[PDB]
Amino acid sequence: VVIGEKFPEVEVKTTHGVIKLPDYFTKQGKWFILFSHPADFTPVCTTEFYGMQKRVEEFRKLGVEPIGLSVDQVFSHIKWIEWIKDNLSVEIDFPVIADDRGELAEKLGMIPSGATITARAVFVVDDKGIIRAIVYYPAEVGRDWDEILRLVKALKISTEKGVALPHKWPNNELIGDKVIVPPASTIEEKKQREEAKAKGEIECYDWWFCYKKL
Amino acid sequence: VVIGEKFPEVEVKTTHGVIKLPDYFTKQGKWFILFSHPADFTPVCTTEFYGMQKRVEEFRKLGVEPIGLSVDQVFSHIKWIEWIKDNLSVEIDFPVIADDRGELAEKLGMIPSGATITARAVFVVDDKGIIRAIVYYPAEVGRDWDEILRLVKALKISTEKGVALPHKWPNNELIGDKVIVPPASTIEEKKQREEAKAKGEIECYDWWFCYKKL
Amino acid sequence: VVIGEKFPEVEVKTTHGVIKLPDYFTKQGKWFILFSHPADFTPVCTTEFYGMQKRVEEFRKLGVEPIGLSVDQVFSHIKWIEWIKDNLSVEIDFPVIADDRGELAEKLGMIPSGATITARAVFVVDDKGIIRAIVYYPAEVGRDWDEILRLVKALKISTEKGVALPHKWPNNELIGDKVIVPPASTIEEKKQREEAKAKGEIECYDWWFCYKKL
Amino acid sequence: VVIGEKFPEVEVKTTHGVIKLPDYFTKQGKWFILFSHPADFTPVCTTEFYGMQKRVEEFRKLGVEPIGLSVDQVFSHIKWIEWIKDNLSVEIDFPVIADDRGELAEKLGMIPSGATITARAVFVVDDKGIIRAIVYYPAEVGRDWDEILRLVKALKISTEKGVALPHKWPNNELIGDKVIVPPASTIEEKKQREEAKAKGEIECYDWWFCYKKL
Amino acid sequence: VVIGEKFPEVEVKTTHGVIKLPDYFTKQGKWFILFSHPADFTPVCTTEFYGMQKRVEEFRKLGVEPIGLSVDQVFSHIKWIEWIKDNLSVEIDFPVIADDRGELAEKLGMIPSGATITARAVFVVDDKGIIRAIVYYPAEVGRDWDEILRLVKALKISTEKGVALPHKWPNNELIGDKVIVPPASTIEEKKQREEAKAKGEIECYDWWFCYKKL
Amino acid sequence: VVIGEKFPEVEVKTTHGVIKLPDYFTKQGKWFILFSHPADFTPVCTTEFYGMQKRVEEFRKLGVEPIGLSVDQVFSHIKWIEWIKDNLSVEIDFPVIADDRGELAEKLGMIPSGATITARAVFVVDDKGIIRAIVYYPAEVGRDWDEILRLVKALKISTEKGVALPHKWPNNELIGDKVIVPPASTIEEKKQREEAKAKGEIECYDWWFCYKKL
Amino acid sequence: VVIGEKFPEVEVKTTHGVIKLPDYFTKQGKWFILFSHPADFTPVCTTEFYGMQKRVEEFRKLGVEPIGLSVDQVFSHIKWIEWIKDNLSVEIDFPVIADDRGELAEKLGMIPSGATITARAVFVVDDKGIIRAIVYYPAEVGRDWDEILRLVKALKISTEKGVALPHKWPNNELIGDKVIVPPASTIEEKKQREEAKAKGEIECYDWWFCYKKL
Amino acid sequence: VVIGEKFPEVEVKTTHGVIKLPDYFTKQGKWFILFSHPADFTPVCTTEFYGMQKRVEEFRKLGVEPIGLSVDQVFSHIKWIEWIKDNLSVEIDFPVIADDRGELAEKLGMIPSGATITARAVFVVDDKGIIRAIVYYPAEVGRDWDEILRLVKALKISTEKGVALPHKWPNNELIGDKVIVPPASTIEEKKQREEAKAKGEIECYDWWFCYKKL
Amino acid sequence: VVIGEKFPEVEVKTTHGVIKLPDYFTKQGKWFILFSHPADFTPVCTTEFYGMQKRVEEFRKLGVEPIGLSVDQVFSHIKWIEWIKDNLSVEIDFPVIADDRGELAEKLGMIPSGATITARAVFVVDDKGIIRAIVYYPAEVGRDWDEILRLVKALKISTEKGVALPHKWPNNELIGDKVIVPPASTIEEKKQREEAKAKGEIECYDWWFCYKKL
């Protein structure tokens, strides 16, 4: 699959029971961040779950629900979750999909070449079942949930306000926390941008690079 | 394509001339980070190029060569690079592929659904020409080259020292900047880990979760 | 495609916005001249745009609308048109198509063998959406818009009056600015042509070669 | 798969390392009994692992090496094996395959209809790599390793002594622990059986039903 | 065919006449055990028909009807049944299918690789026409009808009480004749188990290993 | 298969052991008569076996070996033959093929439509492996071995003396036991027949209907 | 085609005109015997036609109509029939098909290997258009219409009275002209056979071999 | 195409205009003779046109319209006809088809192997649009229109009188100008011919060879 | 097949034996005329055989061998030839093919639409195996061997002298018995034609219509 493509209609067994994706979340009017991990009872995967659990409320506060998956079975999932609770006193409270035969994984291209388990994939899906972003980190390198958070915050504001976010937003090197106006793509639109700048409605480096505050 | 797969043999037109990937870089013993952008003379893309140029030295220092691409032609590239010089006072010194008909973009799944241009993809390829990581951000959300920098540093380190990096390394919530020992996957490897900690030599939360300083 | 064939129904993105061909022009009861150029910011193409713009009203006055096409994206298109106004003090005012991946270019056979950009093609399409003439010039040789003007003028007169135009009309070596009567195709029509001679209403070299003043 | 067929060539990841089947055991001139279980950390499966461990040297003594499998991953396997040790005081010492995506399971028809995990299958393979017997029990009913043991004992004997084993051997209702001579299949063999009976060299109910002590 | 699949609808010729499977038995609200044997007038098969007849009423008590099959013809079946009667004073009173060309045998994978007759297959089918278990023993090794009885008793109780049976039930080494509660597969179910144990009607080794008496 | 074709190379299991046809007989410079019957222990079939046996030596003296075929197995064959000895005092001494699944039968078209057993087929094959005649009688109507004897005798003479045999030979209504000269098929051959008539070395009704004594 | 198959609907040109097979005969409620011969004006074929004509009334009596076939054309057929009358004092009065290109011949497998003309085939088709028997004799050996007469008489009685006919009926070596009762094929039928005999009205050698008079 | 088939529906361009074959003639109740010639301005072809023109009224009286064809274009046809007029003082008044790409020529098999022009083909087509005769002479040998005239006359009479014409009719060596009665093809027809013969309206050499005065 | 196409390699049965075409004739350095007739013992066909025999030596003299063919068998052929000898005192001495199944007839397209026998075809094949001319007359219209003779004579002369024969040669309306010079087909050949005339050698109507005495 690819960005812009609606998440496939699929039923999955999870630590919270059998659910329908993307329906289960879209009907609640929520976005969701599906992410995979190579295997239960593995170190990096464990650190990422602790990290994600420490941030679950931030994603939720934005209306984005985290949901995980690996090719292990649900009983292993629960025993691994219990391990995390008994040792790190952290209680995982988001669902984890048990993709028994890695069927959903393969469909989403989460399985690396010649492997039989997933890598570290991330799929941001909105309240309309649309895939908005995709990340494939390798098994040997843990992700940074803080960047994924910046990504989704940016994704929400882009949809809400109809603007684009610059590099490293809200800490862009050129315009700080200002947002970008989609570029004019017609002779007529170019005129409007120039008139808009004249009225002080927007700032710009050129007719195609306009920006402003939120 | 997917992680672990070898970058495809392709001849491309760049602002530094016609080259062949991944050969051009691998024969120089260099890694390379290929990244795409929707189009020349567009706001977000420009802020990303500025952001990349500011960090190019840090990438090259690690033996990773940046190279961009869009579906525009090479003459527009140089004209846009000239605009960046005349307006942002920085000179792009990394090659940029002119994927004229988006043949390469399509082969690398860079084209979002229903679009005729690329989104913001990133492919990290090592000196053996193997795709090590892939990122797909939408046109509306610029990337954060610092997270990508952290990604490649992690990748270089895991390849050179045979370790795995924990979530948000080197600032992990559990083991700070320490690295992780690939989990034992056999009864024997398990025994070796249990004894390995019987007398220093390594730290661990469990036999499958061992870590150390690098 | 070939002469006599209906211009294909297609949606195109231009400097004047999105338009459906041949619909956009055919419903105005106008003809259009679709011509392509290798790339934006290239010398020969620039000279042809200068040439076309200076002749635009001559085509428009004949009910013929010029529209360009390149494999570049629309933003470069506008940047280039801007360079043309700032350096050659010429204001391009005909739409230019941004055939992003050369989809239309390929369907129209505009891309040379072993190339990824268009050559210098021209398609004359009448108010019926019918292709009346096609021209394919290579990147290294600019066209001559005056010969194309003579082409369109001959085409319109041919349709309007039901006559044929001799070599180099209206400056033919044998009959000058006179036109040709489509040749008799039957025994009876041959007789009609002969009676139309000798105490006749027509000039001719033979029964199949009849001509007259327009 | 069906009886008499050759066990397919395949690479499997097990708790004892990666090996190739059937080669690994057949190249050693060994037999092996591959059996599956639905999933790690499930009750019936645990009672069967306990039961099998209690009988491993019984099968080994016969030259028959036991090897299990489920679609769980190896790390989960080792942990489950650890649980059995700390809660049932028994150390599983036979390898267990991690059929990550149920690839081998599907190949051997171990997956019941509508399921995404194995049922309780048993395959008896000899040193020639030939499947000598197959059992498919459902998830809800545990097997009986004693019947499987009787099964392999009869198989080993029939192979080395060229005899058949009656129902419930060595406790057959009709001939106790005596074995059966493969039935005469030609007029000539029938003759030599009637003659072998006349000289008390064999006991029989008829010419096709001859039996003897080992 | 595999466990869980519905037994195929087929018309078979038997010693009791022509009947349709699984209908003939399902419409009576009964289960049936279909088993095959290499050939009529062979020793091992004869010991099995004797063993089956002596246990036919115990199968019938549970509402399970035994029905045999071989690639021999009906006339031979009856003569063989007649032989058994005259030489072993046992009357066979279960139907035997004359699968003339082994068409049904092949559909059910009863014919060993490189063979022209069936092996010793056993199919347990419930009143809903669903295959609950399958067994394939080779020609050289007779089955043990008591293990099949244990298997069918477990199946019946499993379907009635919604429980699972432990290894060697009702003689399991760990819990004897006690049955197993299907393992909790969700976080919520696990909680119900922990509360069911601590002050409740449930014994357990862990939240996933719960059991009770019948 | 049809007359003229060489009998198919096939291995068959018979009451006299496994043999390869037609090799088994052709190597002995023998002809063979392969015939089938619906099933063992059936009336018409028993009457045909009694008749064949009473004529077996008659076929053998002509260098023709009889060999039966049934879709029954070999053990039933020997049992049925035993029944013939004990009830009719006749000792069957020709081999009978056990075509377990009717594979050879189907290859030779011996299975009537909608049936799963053979009809009453007869194939006469010569020492060269060539099928010389084919007969298909239905199950309800027994054959007459005397007519097959006539057929075989005529066949032998036809091959040895290059003559053809008339209707009901050697009791033909027109020429009794005299044989027929293959008809002249060329103008020249017709002349050498009209001559043979002249010097009375041939009798004839016409140039194409010549006959003589053996 | 094979016994039991419906005779193919086909139109044929004959010496008695064009007719539709098998309708022409079935609609009259009659049976027919279709027989072929290699070619007109050949000796064996001639003796066979003479032989058939002398028995036509006996076939007709039984409600069976003979009809010939060969690849010659109808004109030769009539000249040959004329030769037969002029030289043998016999008048052929049954239809003979002119299978011009051997299309029906090929359809019914009458053409021997490598030939372009039929062999001596015979098809007995009943009033239902069902092929009841088939015979393929070679060109060098004429048939015996008396055997086919015996065949058809048995076929009719069998169909009429629901009985089977023994070898050489009505001159069976064992039971003379008595007919056979189709063998009991079930345990129940066997019982009713034993009751029909022993203080009953049926003769038999065993329960499956019962016979009586008409 | 072949004799007996319907002439193909085709629109053709001729020296008399565009018409539809065979309709143009059939809807008028006229037959037509389509004849091809290799090329315009070729010697043999010219002598044949001169030849045809001299006999056109002969064909026309019989209701048969001649129409020519070659792969030349219509304008050349007219110039050639004009040439014929100016040099042979004869006026061609039959239409000639301009089969530009030889589409009809190929469909009618008028193109010899390895050629791209027609040979000298002749098609006689009746008022029912049925092809009645076909001739193919090579380029090097001119035809003889008188034989085609005899052919069309015989063809017409045959259709009107329902008779066949002997060799070289009406100048047959055996029966002069008499016609032949189609041969009896059934026994019944043979009888009527012998009746008509014996004192009747029929002469003959045999029952299959009847003739009479027209 | 068409003109110029090589005659197919084929073995045929004829009244003169089995021969291979076109080899049999080509190897003798002879040409041959293959002609077919609908059926033996038919009127028109018989008149054509008589006609051909009377002219056989005329064809044979030109080195052309006649050979006939019908879908009848050889025996019937010989009897028909015998009838012609007995009644018309003429002896057929040319071979006649027995195309038993009409396979060669079909291959050469001698079978009219919806028929099962050949029509009246003629094929002239030269000593190189090339079909030089083809004629297809209907069953109802006899041919005229004198026209075929003219064709063959003209054919032999064109090959030998490299000239073309005008319409009705040697009785052409324009140039009588003179032959035609193949037309100049290049500017240079046109020159020499005019030169050839400038000084005797050839007579002409134009540069493309040149003729000379044979």
mmCIF file of N, CA, C and O in Angstrom, chain B residues 13 37-42 70-76 79 83 99-103 106 111 115-117, chain C residues 37-42 70-73 75-76 79 83 99-103 105-106 111 115-118:
data_model
loop_
_atom_site.group_PDB
_atom_site.id
_atom_site.type_symbol
_atom_site.label_atom_id
_atom_site.label_comp_id
_atom_site.label_asym_id
_atom_site.label_seq_id
_atom_site.Cartn_x
_atom_site.Cartn_y
_atom_site.Cartn_z
ATOM 1 N N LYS B 13 19.690 10.840 -14.090
ATOM 2 C CA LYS B 13 20.242 12.146 -14.449
ATOM 3 C C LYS B 13 20.285 12.999 -13.184
ATOM 4 O O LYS B 13 19.258 13.177 -12.524
ATOM 5 N N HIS B 37 11.310 14.956 -2.988
ATOM 6 C CA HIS B 37 10.479 16.083 -2.611
ATOM 7 C C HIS B 37 9.509 16.276 -3.764
ATOM 8 O O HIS B 37 9.858 16.061 -4.920
ATOM 9 N N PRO B 38 8.263 16.652 -3.458
ATOM 10 C CA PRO B 38 7.218 16.873 -4.463
ATOM 11 C C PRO B 38 7.632 17.679 -5.704
ATOM 12 O O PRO B 38 7.466 17.210 -6.835
ATOM 13 N N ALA B 39 8.160 18.888 -5.509
ATOM 14 C CA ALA B 39 8.542 19.697 -6.662
ATOM 15 C C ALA B 39 9.442 20.895 -6.372
ATOM 16 O O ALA B 39 9.411 21.467 -5.280
ATOM 17 N N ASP B 40 10.234 21.273 -7.373
ATOM 18 C CA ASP B 40 11.126 22.424 -7.263
ATOM 19 C C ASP B 40 10.246 23.663 -7.138
ATOM 20 O O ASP B 40 9.088 23.659 -7.568
ATOM 21 N N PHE B 41 10.798 24.718 -6.554
ATOM 22 C CA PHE B 41 10.066 25.959 -6.350
ATOM 23 C C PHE B 41 8.767 25.780 -5.559
ATOM 24 O O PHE B 41 7.717 26.294 -5.956
ATOM 25 N N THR B 42 8.838 25.035 -4.460
ATOM 26 C CA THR B 42 7.694 24.837 -3.575
ATOM 27 C C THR B 42 8.268 25.077 -2.181
ATOM 28 O O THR B 42 9.395 24.672 -1.888
ATOM 29 N N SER B 70 13.166 14.592 -7.550
ATOM 30 C CA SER B 70 11.798 15.045 -7.736
ATOM 31 C C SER B 70 11.481 14.721 -9.180
ATOM 32 O O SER B 70 12.365 14.302 -9.942
ATOM 33 N N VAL B 71 10.229 14.901 -9.567
ATOM 34 C CA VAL B 71 9.874 14.598 -10.931
ATOM 35 C C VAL B 71 10.131 15.780 -11.877
ATOM 36 O O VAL B 71 9.718 15.748 -13.026
ATOM 37 N N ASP B 72 10.834 16.814 -11.407
ATOM 38 C CA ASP B 72 11.165 17.963 -12.267
ATOM 39 C C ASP B 72 12.367 17.592 -13.143
ATOM 40 O O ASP B 72 12.953 16.519 -12.977
ATOM 41 N N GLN B 73 12.734 18.491 -14.061
ATOM 42 C CA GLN B 73 13.891 18.278 -14.933
ATOM 43 C C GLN B 73 15.131 18.941 -14.326
ATOM 44 O O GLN B 73 15.022 19.830 -13.485
ATOM 45 N N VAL B 74 16.309 18.515 -14.767
ATOM 46 C CA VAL B 74 17.567 19.025 -14.239
ATOM 47 C C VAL B 74 17.807 20.534 -14.401
ATOM 48 O O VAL B 74 18.481 21.148 -13.569
ATOM 49 N N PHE B 75 17.253 21.146 -15.442
ATOM 50 C CA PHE B 75 17.454 22.583 -15.633
ATOM 51 C C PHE B 75 16.691 23.388 -14.578
ATOM 52 O O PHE B 75 17.143 24.446 -14.148
ATOM 53 N N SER B 76 15.544 22.870 -14.146
ATOM 54 C CA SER B 76 14.752 23.536 -13.115
ATOM 55 C C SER B 76 15.481 23.386 -11.785
ATOM 56 O O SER B 76 15.479 24.298 -10.965
ATOM 57 N N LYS B 79 18.167 25.840 -11.525
ATOM 58 C CA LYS B 79 17.581 27.168 -11.450
ATOM 59 C C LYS B 79 17.053 27.401 -10.036
ATOM 60 O O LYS B 79 17.169 28.496 -9.494
ATOM 61 N N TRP B 83 18.158 29.918 -7.004
ATOM 62 C CA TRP B 83 17.237 30.744 -6.235
ATOM 63 C C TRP B 83 17.570 30.622 -4.746
ATOM 64 O O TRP B 83 17.581 31.616 -4.015
ATOM 65 N N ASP B 99 14.230 12.876 -11.955
ATOM 66 C CA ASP B 99 13.480 11.680 -12.321
ATOM 67 C C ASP B 99 12.340 12.130 -13.246
ATOM 68 O O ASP B 99 11.169 12.077 -12.882
ATOM 69 N N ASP B 100 12.726 12.572 -14.446
ATOM 70 C CA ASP B 100 11.834 13.100 -15.487
ATOM 71 C C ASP B 100 10.408 12.582 -15.580
ATOM 72 O O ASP B 100 9.461 13.369 -15.602
ATOM 73 N N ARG B 101 10.254 11.266 -15.670
ATOM 74 C CA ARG B 101 8.928 10.665 -15.788
ATOM 75 C C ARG B 101 8.509 9.917 -14.525
ATOM 76 O O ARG B 101 7.521 9.189 -14.527
ATOM 77 N N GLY B 102 9.266 10.099 -13.451
ATOM 78 C CA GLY B 102 8.945 9.425 -12.209
ATOM 79 C C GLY B 102 9.063 7.912 -12.288
ATOM 80 O O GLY B 102 8.410 7.197 -11.533
ATOM 81 N N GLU B 103 9.885 7.411 -13.203
ATOM 82 C CA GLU B 103 10.063 5.970 -13.327
ATOM 83 C C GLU B 103 10.681 5.422 -12.044
ATOM 84 O O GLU B 103 10.211 4.426 -11.493
ATOM 85 N N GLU B 106 8.288 5.700 -8.903
ATOM 86 C CA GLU B 106 7.265 4.667 -8.909
ATOM 87 C C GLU B 106 7.827 3.321 -8.453
ATOM 88 O O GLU B 106 7.182 2.589 -7.692
ATOM 89 N N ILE B 111 5.342 7.591 -5.040
ATOM 90 C CA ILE B 111 4.159 8.307 -5.499
ATOM 91 C C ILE B 111 2.878 8.001 -4.721
ATOM 92 O O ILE B 111 2.342 6.898 -4.795
ATOM 93 N N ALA B 115 -1.603 10.568 -7.164
ATOM 94 C CA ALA B 115 -0.695 11.662 -7.506
ATOM 95 C C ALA B 115 0.212 11.316 -8.683
ATOM 96 O O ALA B 115 0.335 10.153 -9.071
ATOM 97 N N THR B 116 0.840 12.341 -9.250
ATOM 98 C CA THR B 116 1.751 12.167 -10.377
ATOM 99 C C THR B 116 3.140 12.704 -10.015
ATOM 100 O O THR B 116 4.007 12.854 -10.875
ATOM 101 N N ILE B 117 3.332 13.014 -8.738
ATOM 102 C CA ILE B 117 4.612 13.507 -8.245
ATOM 103 C C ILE B 117 4.906 12.708 -6.978
ATOM 104 O O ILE B 117 4.039 11.992 -6.475
ATOM 105 N N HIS C 37 7.596 20.905 -25.797
ATOM 106 C CA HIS C 37 8.980 21.334 -25.793
ATOM 107 C C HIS C 37 9.730 20.452 -24.803
ATOM 108 O O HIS C 37 9.202 20.088 -23.751
ATOM 109 N N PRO C 38 10.970 20.077 -25.144
ATOM 110 C CA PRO C 38 11.821 19.225 -24.309
ATOM 111 C C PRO C 38 11.827 19.574 -22.827
ATOM 112 O O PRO C 38 11.459 18.754 -21.993
ATOM 113 N N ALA C 39 12.239 20.788 -22.495
ATOM 114 C CA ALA C 39 12.290 21.187 -21.096
ATOM 115 C C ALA C 39 12.230 22.685 -20.888
ATOM 116 O O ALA C 39 12.526 23.478 -21.788
ATOM 117 N N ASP C 40 11.836 23.056 -19.678
ATOM 118 C CA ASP C 40 11.764 24.446 -19.291
ATOM 119 C C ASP C 40 13.214 24.905 -19.105
ATOM 120 O O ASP C 40 14.106 24.074 -18.896
ATOM 121 N N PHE C 41 13.452 26.212 -19.199
ATOM 122 C CA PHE C 41 14.798 26.751 -19.038
ATOM 123 C C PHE C 41 15.827 26.151 -20.006
ATOM 124 O O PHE C 41 16.957 25.848 -19.625
ATOM 125 N N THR C 42 15.412 25.955 -21.252
ATOM 126 C CA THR C 42 16.302 25.460 -22.285
ATOM 127 C C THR C 42 16.190 26.491 -23.403
ATOM 128 O O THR C 42 15.106 27.044 -23.646
ATOM 129 N N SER C 70 5.103 20.296 -21.557
ATOM 130 C CA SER C 70 6.451 19.900 -21.193
ATOM 131 C C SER C 70 6.335 18.876 -20.086
ATOM 132 O O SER C 70 5.285 18.751 -19.461
ATOM 133 N N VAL C 71 7.417 18.159 -19.821
ATOM 134 C CA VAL C 71 7.374 17.159 -18.782
ATOM 135 C C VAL C 71 7.729 17.762 -17.414
ATOM 136 O O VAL C 71 7.780 17.052 -16.413
ATOM 137 N N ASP C 72 7.941 19.080 -17.370
ATOM 138 C CA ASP C 72 8.243 19.781 -16.110
ATOM 139 C C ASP C 72 6.964 20.005 -15.279
ATOM 140 O O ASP C 72 5.849 19.833 -15.779
ATOM 141 N N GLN C 73 7.126 20.395 -14.013
ATOM 142 C CA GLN C 73 5.975 20.670 -13.155
ATOM 143 C C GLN C 73 5.566 22.138 -13.339
ATOM 144 O O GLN C 73 6.363 22.970 -13.770
ATOM 145 N N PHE C 75 5.137 24.675 -11.377
ATOM 146 C CA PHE C 75 5.860 25.744 -10.704
ATOM 147 C C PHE C 75 7.046 26.251 -11.529
ATOM 148 O O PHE C 75 7.283 27.465 -11.607
ATOM 149 N N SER C 76 7.777 25.333 -12.160
ATOM 150 C CA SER C 76 8.914 25.724 -12.988
ATOM 151 C C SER C 76 8.356 26.463 -14.196
ATOM 152 O O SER C 76 8.940 27.441 -14.659
ATOM 153 N N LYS C 79 7.892 29.934 -13.278
ATOM 154 C CA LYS C 79 9.192 30.529 -13.000
ATOM 155 C C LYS C 79 9.862 30.890 -14.323
ATOM 156 O O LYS C 79 10.487 31.944 -14.453
ATOM 157 N N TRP C 83 10.907 34.326 -16.113
ATOM 158 C CA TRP C 83 12.235 34.639 -16.616
ATOM 159 C C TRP C 83 12.084 35.265 -17.998
ATOM 160 O O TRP C 83 12.846 36.153 -18.372
ATOM 161 N N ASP C 99 2.758 18.051 -17.913
ATOM 162 C CA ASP C 99 2.557 16.608 -18.064
ATOM 163 C C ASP C 99 3.621 15.941 -17.193
ATOM 164 O O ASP C 99 4.620 15.423 -17.694
ATOM 165 N N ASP C 100 3.376 15.986 -15.885
ATOM 166 C CA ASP C 100 4.266 15.470 -14.834
ATOM 167 C C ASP C 100 5.071 14.202 -15.081
ATOM 168 O O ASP C 100 6.275 14.174 -14.817
ATOM 169 N N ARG C 101 4.421 13.144 -15.548
ATOM 170 C CA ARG C 101 5.144 11.910 -15.802
ATOM 171 C C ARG C 101 5.182 11.548 -17.281
ATOM 172 O O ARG C 101 5.510 10.421 -17.650
ATOM 173 N N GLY C 102 4.865 12.524 -18.123
ATOM 174 C CA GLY C 102 4.870 12.304 -19.558
ATOM 175 C C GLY C 102 3.813 11.318 -20.014
ATOM 176 O O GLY C 102 4.000 10.626 -21.017
ATOM 177 N N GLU C 103 2.702 11.253 -19.285
ATOM 178 C CA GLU C 103 1.617 10.338 -19.631
ATOM 179 C C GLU C 103 0.963 10.722 -20.951
ATOM 180 O O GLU C 103 0.792 9.880 -21.832
ATOM 181 N N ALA C 105 2.217 12.847 -23.104
ATOM 182 C CA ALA C 105 3.301 12.842 -24.082
ATOM 183 C C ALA C 105 3.449 11.452 -24.719
ATOM 184 O O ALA C 105 3.550 11.331 -25.939
ATOM 185 N N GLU C 106 3.456 10.411 -23.888
ATOM 186 C CA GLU C 106 3.604 9.044 -24.373
ATOM 187 C C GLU C 106 2.421 8.607 -25.231
ATOM 188 O O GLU C 106 2.600 7.999 -26.291
ATOM 189 N N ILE C 111 7.452 11.331 -27.175
ATOM 190 C CA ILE C 111 8.753 11.022 -26.590
ATOM 191 C C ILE C 111 9.637 10.161 -27.494
ATOM 192 O O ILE C 111 9.284 9.031 -27.827
ATOM 193 N N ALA C 115 14.406 8.180 -24.723
ATOM 194 C CA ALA C 115 14.354 9.485 -24.071
ATOM 195 C C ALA C 115 13.321 9.463 -22.954
ATOM 196 O O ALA C 115 12.488 8.558 -22.885
ATOM 197 N N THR C 116 13.380 10.462 -22.079
ATOM 198 C CA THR C 116 12.439 10.562 -20.967
ATOM 199 C C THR C 116 11.758 11.932 -20.931
ATOM 200 O O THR C 116 11.128 12.308 -19.936
ATOM 201 N N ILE C 117 11.909 12.681 -22.020
ATOM 202 C CA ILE C 117 11.298 13.996 -22.156
ATOM 203 C C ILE C 117 10.778 14.072 -23.583
ATOM 204 O O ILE C 117 11.160 13.265 -24.428
ATOM 205 N N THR C 118 9.898 15.026 -23.855
ATOM 206 C CA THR C 118 9.333 15.152 -25.188
ATOM 207 C C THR C 118 10.309 15.755 -26.179
ATOM 208 O O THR C 118 11.339 16.309 -25.804
#
